[PDB]
Design a protein around this motif. Sequence first.
Motif, PDB file in Angstrom:
ATOM      1  N   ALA A 111      54.128  -0.777  25.749  1.00 58.56           N
ATOM      2  CA  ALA A 111      53.185   0.153  25.151  1.00 58.56           C
ATOM      3  C   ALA A 111      52.015   0.464  26.066  1.00 58.56           C
ATOM      4  N   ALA A 112      51.600  -0.487  26.901  1.00 62.94           N
ATOM      5  CA  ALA A 112      50.554  -0.202  27.873  1.00 62.94           C
ATOM      6  C   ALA A 112      51.017   0.782  28.937  1.00 62.94           C
ATOM      7  N   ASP A 113      52.322   0.866  29.189  1.00 65.37           N
ATOM      8  CA  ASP A 113      52.887   1.778  30.172  1.00 65.37           C
ATOM      9  C   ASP A 113      53.037   3.195  29.642  1.00 65.37           C
ATOM     10  N   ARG A 114      52.838   3.402  28.344  1.00 61.88           N
ATOM     11  CA  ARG A 114      52.921   4.720  27.744  1.00 61.88           C
ATOM     12  C   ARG A 114      51.560   5.334  27.465  1.00 61.88           C
ATOM     13  N   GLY A 115      50.471   4.638  27.775  1.00 60.70           N
ATOM     14  CA  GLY A 115      49.152   5.104  27.417  1.00 60.70           C
ATOM     15  C   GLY A 115      48.784   4.866  25.975  1.00 60.70           C
ATOM     16  N   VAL A 116      49.665   4.231  25.196  1.00 55.92           N
ATOM     17  CA  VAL A 116      49.418   3.992  23.780  1.00 55.92           C
ATOM     18  C   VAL A 116      48.564   2.759  23.535  1.00 55.92           C
ATOM     19  N   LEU A 117      48.481   1.846  24.499  1.00 57.20           N
ATOM     20  CA  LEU A 117      47.729   0.615  24.332  1.00 57.20           C
ATOM     21  C   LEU A 117      46.894   0.374  25.577  1.00 57.20           C
ATOM     22  N   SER A 118      45.752  -0.273  25.384  1.00 49.92           N
ATOM     23  CA  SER A 118      44.869  -0.660  26.470  1.00 49.92           C
ATOM     24  C   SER A 118      44.963  -2.162  26.686  1.00 49.92           C
TER      25      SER A 118
END
Length: 1270
Positions: A623-630
């Motif tokens: 999810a961090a690789d999709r811009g959805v999570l920080s």
Amino acid sequence: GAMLDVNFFDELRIGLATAEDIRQWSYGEVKKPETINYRTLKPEKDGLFCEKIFGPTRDWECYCGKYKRVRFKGIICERCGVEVTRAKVRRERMGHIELAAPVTHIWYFKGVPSRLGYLLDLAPKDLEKIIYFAAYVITSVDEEMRHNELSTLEAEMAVERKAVEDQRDGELEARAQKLEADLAELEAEGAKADARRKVRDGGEREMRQIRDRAQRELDRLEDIWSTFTKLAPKQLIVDENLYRELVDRYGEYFTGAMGAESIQKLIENFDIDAEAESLRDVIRNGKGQKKLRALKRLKVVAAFQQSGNSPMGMVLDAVPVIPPELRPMVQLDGGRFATSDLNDLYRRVINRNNRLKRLIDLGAPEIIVNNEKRMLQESVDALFDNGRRGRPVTGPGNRPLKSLSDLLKGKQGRFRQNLLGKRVDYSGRSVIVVGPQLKLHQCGLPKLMALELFKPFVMKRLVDLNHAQNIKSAKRMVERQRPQVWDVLEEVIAEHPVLLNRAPTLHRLGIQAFEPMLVEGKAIQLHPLVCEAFNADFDGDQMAVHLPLSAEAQAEARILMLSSNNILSPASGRPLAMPRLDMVTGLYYLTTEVPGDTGEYQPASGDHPETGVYSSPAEAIMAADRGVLSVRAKIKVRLTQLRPPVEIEAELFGHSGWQPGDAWMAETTLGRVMFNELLPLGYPFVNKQMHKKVQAAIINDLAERYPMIVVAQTVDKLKDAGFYWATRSGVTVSMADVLVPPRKKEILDHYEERADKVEKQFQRGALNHDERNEALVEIWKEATDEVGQALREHYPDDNPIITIVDSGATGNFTQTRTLAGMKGLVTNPKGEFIPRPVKSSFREGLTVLEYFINTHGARKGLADTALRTADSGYLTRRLVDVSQDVIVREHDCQTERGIVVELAERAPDGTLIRDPYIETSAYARTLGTDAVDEAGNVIVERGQDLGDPEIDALLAAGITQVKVRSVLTCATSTGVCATCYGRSMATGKLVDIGEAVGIVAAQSIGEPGTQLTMRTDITGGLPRVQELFEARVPRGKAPIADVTGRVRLEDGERFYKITIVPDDGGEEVVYDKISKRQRLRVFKRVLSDGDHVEVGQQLMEGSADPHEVLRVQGPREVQIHLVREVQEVYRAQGVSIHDKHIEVIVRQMLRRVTIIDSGSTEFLPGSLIDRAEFEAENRRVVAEGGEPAAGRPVLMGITKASLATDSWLSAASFQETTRVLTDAAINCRSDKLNGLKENVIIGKLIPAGTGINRYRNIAVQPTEEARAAA
DNA sequence: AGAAAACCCTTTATTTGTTATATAGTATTTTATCCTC
DNA sequence: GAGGATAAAATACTATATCCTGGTTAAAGGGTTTTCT
RNA sequence: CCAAAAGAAGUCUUUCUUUUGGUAACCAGGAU
Ligand SMILES: [Zn+2]
Ligand SMILES: [Zn+2]
């Protein structure tokens, strides 16, 4: 003993050499001032390079050429006389010069104190007269033949005087008759006043002249008689004519000489026992300067009495000549030679000796012969020590020549330059760069350097693999660099350690061993996590590479010196391989929780379920690789491979623990899961932001509870993550990021009004100059603080500058205030604040005057460092020498003595507040007694490491003082034991039975110098430390009390006056000259009249001298004083040094005792002798009757103690080489070769670490089962 | 046989005299003056 | 008034981190020797 | 331990034998 030496040495003995030894060493006599024939280029005969004396210049080739073959050996050619042998003998064979007159040695005449002037009891001023032909000396007198012929000659002298006086009286009578005739002339004819007065003046003038002649001659004869009657040996007869008259009139009854032969005759007629007995009697009775002079004289007289050696070796009759190969002249191209500068000094001696020798046989007056002898005497003085007396003999360009003494003294002498430090093979150097890709045990070595260091090892493998027929072919291959040498090299260098070193090597970790690997380039690549140990930045530093060869040298670089085996500092035990700078910023960014970030956890709203929950850390990384999570958003994850914290593990799993695989739910950020994946598997989950302090705590915990390999791997993984995330942290510097305080002008105007009012008050005479300056300084300090606070409150938390400051990476906030808000007050060249002050930041830009007044202090700061860099090294060199003989020798002396430790004194209302400096005084110690509290059982047993858990237990149990073991009280004879020393700060376990703790202590004390700022008359920095260790009198000496009671103080004029009232009442102690510029001490209120004082209470404010506190309060109190005083400076500079190092040094400072009463033992009063020798000698003396020697403790500095060592070789190599050598020769000292430095000099294994018998004589054998299995 | 241009040796001389940017520390000789008999 | 003993001053000696490279290495005078004319 | 020359064997260029030949001290300037 040995002659050519095979290293079976047991001792090294020094002593005076006589002429019979000098002409016994000799292989010939040099008697011509020639060196070499310039045309044939062959040594001349009987010269300074003669082959008959010093040996062949060519291997097995005589001078005349009759013999040239090896078969001839050990035979002396009958024609040229040159012995057919190897040419190497020219480094060994000595000649000698046979002097035509005796000559003294300048070492025993000039060097203060003059030792000939103590042996003979002659002042140097008049001894220089005797030995340089400026006065006669009476060497012998007959004192009974005198008595008799003295009565007779008194009669004869009276006869002579009366006869001369009678003759003069007859002359005066004739003059009187002439006067009567003059009167007859006067009165007879007519001649008035003129003639009368003229003749009478003439007559009276003549009469008075005759009287004067009589008186003068009588005075001369009286002087002759007076000098003869009181003639004594060692009497200087100046006024040549007096001596000539005496020797002519009474040539018998006495013999007198001049020059060095007179001193030789004085020594011959000199019994050494009567002199010693007389000096001892004067010591026992005289007192005063007579006793203080007899004590000095008796040293040399006893030295010459005890030994079989004679004092005649001071006056020389032959001079030795050093072998030619040690004073070579070499052919420079163009028919030019480079002499060794000893050949000139030898040539002068030979020329003068030949001239004097020729002037004696030819016959000459005494004047000329004595002149030649004086010049010969001066030539030998220049040969031995050029410039110690008079004008140095100068060569070309008016530069003094290098005498024999110059070859041994100073930093460029033989000892320090060549014996203690050498140049070595298999070495290299280059510029270091950063090696972020390396592991902790690896280094990058340029392949052209590696191919050169490992040349012999590659040449063997090239032949072994059939890439070369023989060694010459392999050598040609390596020199030309054919393509297969690289394939061989990468195999050769595998698992072969290499030693890397950066200068100055302040402490142990300045040398470490790595595993080389080839890199492209010319720079050595260094791991980023070793720069704190090396102290190596990348602004142009260089390091040297060494290569171990043998099996032991290679095992010691893998098991002892490997970089990954040394993570902890030996000075304090703190880790040195921690992340820092960019790594700290990256790790601080990663483990930070940003409120309201992308993908955060969201509670259920009633229409949709919870959001932000993840089923694994692999779904969150996706999810961090999709811009959805920080990576810094709070989430909930289901962890299965990370151990839960203590509370969560207790309240969910109980049983035994998580047992990898069991899943728990964590509420954290992704960055913290990533950080905890870098830590070991069984380590709990750390849910915190990684300030540098937190990282230090974690790495200390891991180092305590885990082996070394785990810690090394963990720090490598942390390095990788820190760099990766520091690249992404977004830390840059632009002037838009340097914010300015919003209301600086209001604050500065508000305080400008205050300054204006103060200035107006001064202008109205309300206060003097200094009061106005103080007022302005206080105002501007307040203004600076009020600007700094607004600046602190204006910046956000994500600004790069405050981020770098607050993550602990580097820098403090004063530097941020100086850059953004305001610089403030600056100092003078004197150091007093400029009251202006500077009011601009470096973002706004300083004006010209502000910049100038800022440079004032900037340059002072730079010069301070430039000048302390050398004092630190000098201090470390002295500390290493004083304490080079402290080595762990036993495991347990099993003593019961020990020191006490403060250990959290009790609070007033009742509570145990821990002592702040407990880590450097109580940790890493072993208990001497048992800890019992409130009748409770022993909380901590005797002999325990006394770590963190034990200290916590003792504090919980409620005790405040424990008696622990220390090196100050170790009972071993030579060196400390292991239990008294305690834990090793680097290893973490009990110290070994070979460790050299003295050198470690010296390097730990002296390494953090440099970063020890001198502080603005009481010294407060490196000078304070130096005067503490040198046991000097403090600059600001403050008297201490001598006995309890009340104190009466009279505030006199220009100086105070304090007197102690003794409760006992015996005597009152008075302190008279105490300057009013000092202050009175405050303890608990300023010193008040009638206040009670303790036995050792310090009255004035300053530094008490260590010597008085030792005389009053004893040795334990001075030990406490010294350790506390040194630690105070180091703490003030924020440097952590464990107390056991200072205790090692202080132990070395208190070894000896002073002799006050000799009794019967062979100890001179006032001498300092080792305490153990004192006890042994007193024990030997209690038998054979009772007469103990009285001794008193003494405190010595680190130079006096280190020069009073038992080895003359070590002391000669330390300092004052000439004085140590001359007094060692006079005492005929023998060296047992038992120290580290003495074994280093002679090339033997040091008696420490791996070189002791316990480890050096290990026997390795396969096990029988292993033998069978094979 | 005498004159000129190139060797071999010496010595930086040590006066009734050509030599003034360090300080800090200790140790040993003067020396000057004060106290005593 | 003289002698001795103790402060004073005055000189004498010793020490001041590590590493690297680059330029120079005698003049001057006296007496003598040898070759050339 | 290296260079040169000569003689012998093989390879087309290595091995064997013999001979000859084989540095410092000062002052100065930099770096960390
Ligand atoms: Zn011969
Ligand atoms: Zn012990």
